[PDB]
Design a protein around this ligand. Sequence first.
Ligand SMILES: OC[C@H]1O[C@H](O[C@H]2[C@H](O)[C@@H](O)[C@@H](O)O[C@@H]2CO)[C@H](O)[C@@H](O)[C@@H]1O
Ligand SMILES: OC[C@H]1O[C@H](O[C@H]2[C@H](O)[C@@H](O)[C@@H](O)O[C@@H]2CO)[C@H](O)[C@@H](O)[C@@H]1O
Lengths: 376, 372
Amino acid sequence: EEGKLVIWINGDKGYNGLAEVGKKFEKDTGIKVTVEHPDKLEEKFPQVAATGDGPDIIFWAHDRFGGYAQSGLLAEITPDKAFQDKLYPFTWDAVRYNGKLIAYPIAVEALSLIYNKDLLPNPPKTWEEIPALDRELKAKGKSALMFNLQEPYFTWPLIAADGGYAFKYENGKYDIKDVGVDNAGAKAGLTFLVDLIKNKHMNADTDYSIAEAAFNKGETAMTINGPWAWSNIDTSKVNYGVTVLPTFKGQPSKPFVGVLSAGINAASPNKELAKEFLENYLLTDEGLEAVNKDKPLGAVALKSYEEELAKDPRIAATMENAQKGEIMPNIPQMSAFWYAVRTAVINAASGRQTVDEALKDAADPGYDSIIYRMTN
Amino acid sequence: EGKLVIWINGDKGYNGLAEVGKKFEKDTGIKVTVEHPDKLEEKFPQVAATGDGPDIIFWAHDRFGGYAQSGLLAEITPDKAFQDKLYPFTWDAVRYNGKLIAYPIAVEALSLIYNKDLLPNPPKTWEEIPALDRELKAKGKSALMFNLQEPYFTWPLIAADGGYAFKYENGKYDIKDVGVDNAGAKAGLTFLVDLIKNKHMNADTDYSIAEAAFNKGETAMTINGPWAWSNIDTSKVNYGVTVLPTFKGQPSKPFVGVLSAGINAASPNKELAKEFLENYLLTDEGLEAVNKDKPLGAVALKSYEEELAKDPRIAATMENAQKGEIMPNIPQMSAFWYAVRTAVINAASGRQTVDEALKDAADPGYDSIIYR
Ligand SMILES: OC[C@H]1O[C@H](O[C@H]2[C@H](O)[C@@H](O)[C@@H](O)O[C@@H]2CO)[C@H](O)[C@@H](O)[C@@H]1O
Ligand SMILES: OC[C@H]1O[C@H](O[C@H]2[C@H](O)[C@@H](O)[C@@H](O)O[C@@H]2CO)[C@H](O)[C@@H](O)[C@@H]1O
């Protein structure tokens, strides 16, 4: 680590694009940059950083950074007024924790409906229509919809539709005691999805790669996913639309919005180098274009680059879905929250627990929660 | 790599242990370093989870279930002749999902420790402690000081009239059935907070403060374990070790711990750790070296115990232990202790009331300390 840069980022993002950026950096400065995408980095980072190890720079959606900052794993960052002016105000707000800035914002992510325009000329406006749709679509030996049920992020817009929420957001701060995941909005959302399963419109163990291959091979009319997925759909030549998520009980799907963000390890001795890389190389039209050409970032934080992208109707649809949803909390409880809800969705989907039972556990984990099973 | 590093708590006989380790070094040339880092029981899971940390970790057995569940401990395989040397109940304390995950060392329970001169007659009941504090306060003394910062020291009183942690039914702990906010729990902690509210005890007394006060002859009574008696010997106070007081007529029920040694699952020195524990530490002279530094309590090694059981201080330790309960070793233990610690400190300081402090420990929400 002594005079080089190690960067971690998720394997669904443009880390080859990003590596090309670190080759530029190395070519100008002589500093070696290594980009890695380890499995479950969002869990490894706080483990290795707890002992003063880890990468120099960590990329994740902003929801996790509050917890790292509470744990002291992140350096405070100082961008001057000029630098700050280059990025949207709400992107900075996403990386502000106890009044400090703890990361650089990169890009705004939200989920959308992605549909195969061909076998499905009109999408649905609602979830309601999907069992009747999936049934006529099985006639051609197809299914209507496949998406990741192993990550609760992908089910969340449905759960939030009729009023499921995470922690109530009250004038200023988030109410940690007031947890929305087992209210009747939440219950109705997920019970819908479980019925789709009970009645075989969806399989309970579909994961990210199954939904992706199923979509990209024309096997299923629809999927739910973010900007990063558009690339591989381009490669497959599937004719797709990106559009508004379907409503439920006639309210809009509400996706949790993430700000892909870039933090500097508090234990790093290359903090100054990390600052030059992030500010002068990545967050430029050409740094981001390079990542974005690998896998699309969504609506970027950099105003100069976003000007171009905003003209793409995938990006406008992404943004309209982001409009109906909610910026993720970055509080330290988020991590336990996701772990609970991931288990609760998987449990109810597989019949291991009833909807009421699974979400009650997610809303109020006792000592029987997975969160305290000290599992791995 | 060809080295042994041992972690043991700062209150135990770690110099004694180091004497055992010099003997191992003398015979095998393997260097043994003993350390006692602060907050060892939290550090160990964090460093061990990356693949470093000590070769050998000592703690009471309640924590080893979570370590083992986390993958951090090598399964130990003493043969039958080695097993017959230690008491069966001490092996049971280190069994997790059927496999032995540590060597047992000693049996610990809290006793009442009292100053015989200040108080030729210690109280039988928690209830008479206030009046007796009144008496002592006029003499520039106080009845009782003990660590209020660690729930371990309060547990015997929470448990007296029916507090429990997790219900134990038909060979098994039901982690949905938590007893820490039942009426027994509330009663017990309410008594303690009432003691504090009326200034018979100060809500920030910690281990250090309570030991200095007893050993300087400032307070008639403390609540402590066997490891404490060495410093009392040195201070020359004339003390007895006895039955904890009763609460609403019931015996105090201290959690019973078994000091245990686990071997890091990630150690390259696993065979050496076994030789060290089986052939040096767990012997009359190994344990004697530890014990002479800070007493272990009633040891798991039957040959050494026979000598110790004669000590009237061990007899009382075993009496308190028999009224108490072996701690669970389930992986939920770590988070339970953190919830209860905060509940006790919060109730004692007036941050929360008894009832809501305990409700939060019985049922940790996202608002609880365990999630910050
Ligand atoms: O499923 C819970 C998960 O949701 C979010 O993770 C997203 C991530 O934000 C996106 O960049 C993309 O990579 O997909 C992930 C879902 O698999 C939260 O950021 C994360 O903390 C949470 O665990
Ligand atoms: O206070 C909660 C605490 O209780 C026990 O720790 C004891 C330990 O067993 C004794 O050896 C002695 O050192 O005092 C400790 C309390 O300060 C549990 O063993 C421990 O895991 C728990 O957190």
